[PDB]
Symmetry: D2
Subunit: 179 residues, 4 copies
């Protein structure tokens, strides 16, 4: 009970989610055997997926994070964001995998990809657990995706609403009476 | 294989670790039913423990992080650190739980506790998965602890060495030939 | 011109210049022999920090703080989130917080308490402008420039929607702009 | 005194003051009618930013960048980690990067490429000092103050282990200190 009471629907179940994270983990492990793999996730939304995915990757990898913010209304038209916390690991010549919790319009993601490319990684690929194909507003290639979902107000496994529901073990839709 | 090959000993096993995280989760859930719970962890070491613990807490909680750095040699004598990434959630009047991956000397922890107290949380408690009683150099009260361990160079479940081994599902000791 | 938005000048460029020189002399005498570190809060303190540090004939270091608001905590007890911490280790050092203006003094009291926790040998405050009738905190100002009425002032670092920081004098903004 | 550590003065306080005025006039003419945002890199650009912004009779905004080194990437291709991003939205704005000194120009070229990605209407560079014989990057400087030899200079923002930033002139440090 408690948070699970506010959930109106369960798009992806706990076990359903676990199996996919494990699956993606095997694919990544194989495509990156030999290669300097560095996982970069954007706080805070990606902590849940980052934690599970890295454990599902039997490889010597590094983890780092990025905290960004909005320039008001230039972020929504161009996806331009302010870097609050830059990553500390030097990614030049390394294989970087961007870990996202969800990709919808993809504006901010396309922008971060470009910014990260300017630091010369040997390669840069993107991985998401959630993805809203409808939503797409920018040309971004997701190299690893988890599930495709309808544009509903979802939460859980990192995703939130007013900082809440990040700890739900599944992906559910909040009752429209809460938002 | 791969990273598990560099491990010379396994102090806490995968399942051993999982059960304890679950245990602490039940205790926290009960002590905080009713109360505005906010979990603050210090990057990057605490991401692994944060992720598992919050899922093991059936409560409406908020998560936030802190990124700190060293002032050189004032950090080792006083535990004074520079705030690279401050927390965004306003903790005044809220119940804050500090989530650490490991507590050894406790200097930096005692300092962060004091700094966080200046922001007036309704309460401030500390939780760790790992703890080296020997190590203690400051007076810090750990309200929730996981395991007590000997002062050996350990890694895994968040803890690292040159940014590596954070993704190990267990707590092991690295072979002295690597450090 | 940026200057045409002013209702009246309160302090001329020459007044500021002279007051800054005066404060510089005092600080030079008082800190002779000490390990002085000047810390200003961005972005307001920029002009004053620049002129003041140049008027102090001592081997000082300079650093900066960038802070933000939490919302309620900030307005009530002056609690702020730090966006940019100072890099210099102020332990055992004689620190001087340089501010552009102190009115309520809430945020300042919080920052002083915060820096004290880092063990400076001493900590004092320096402001170029001051609005006494607006205090809300029991803060002590060790070096003060001018005391001014509670008017909407801009110039010499003080802004309004980011504008007017570059005026070489302190003036009152015309009400048709706020 | 801080001044006793100098081997020779290169540019006097009056030279700087006059050069700053001159640059201010040029920028005022060139940016009349535009949306000017000045961005300096902390902490070196502080003195120059202060004097320059005051010498420009235009409605400008001011912001700052705080950067750090990655290690190899920084030294090789001038790539830096940002510790403090600018807060003002520079999209569709006429931005002017204000620097204290450009020698190799590596880090500057990287920051210019980085700010271009944020879509300013225009982006230019302004430095008070310049060491041409030390270039390592194909960077274009739109407004320059003085060209100087490859000497260890301090003052007017330039430091050495955090000291000497407060000298009102540019001088060469005595070798018995490095
Ligand atoms: Mg995201
Ligand atoms: Mg820790
Ligand atoms: Mg101020
Ligand atoms: Mg510079």
């Amino acid at each position: 009970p408690s948070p699970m009471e506010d959930i109106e629907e369960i798009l992806i179940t706990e076990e359903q989610l676990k199996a996919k994270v494990k699956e993606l983990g095997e694919m990544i492990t194989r495509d990156y055997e030999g290669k300097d793999l560095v996982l970069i996730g954007v706080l805070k939304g990606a902590i849940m997926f980052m934690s599970g995915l890295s454990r599902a990757i039997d490889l010597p990898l590094s983890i780092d994070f990025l905290a960004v913010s909005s320039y008001g209304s230039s972020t929504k038209s161009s996806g331009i964001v302010k870097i609050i916390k830059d990553h500390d690991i030097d990614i030049e010549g390394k294989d970087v995998l961007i870990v996202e919790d969800i990709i919808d319009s993809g504006l901010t993601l396309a922008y971060l990809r470009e910014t990260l490319l300017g630091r010369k990684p040997r390669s840069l690929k993107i991985c998401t657990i959630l993805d809203k194909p409808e939503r797409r507003e920018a040309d971004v290639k997701v190299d690893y995706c988890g599930f495709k979902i309808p544009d509903k107000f979802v939460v859980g496994y990192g995703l939130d609403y007013a900082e809440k529901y990040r700890n739900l073990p599944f992906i559910g839709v909040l009752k429209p009476e809460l938002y």
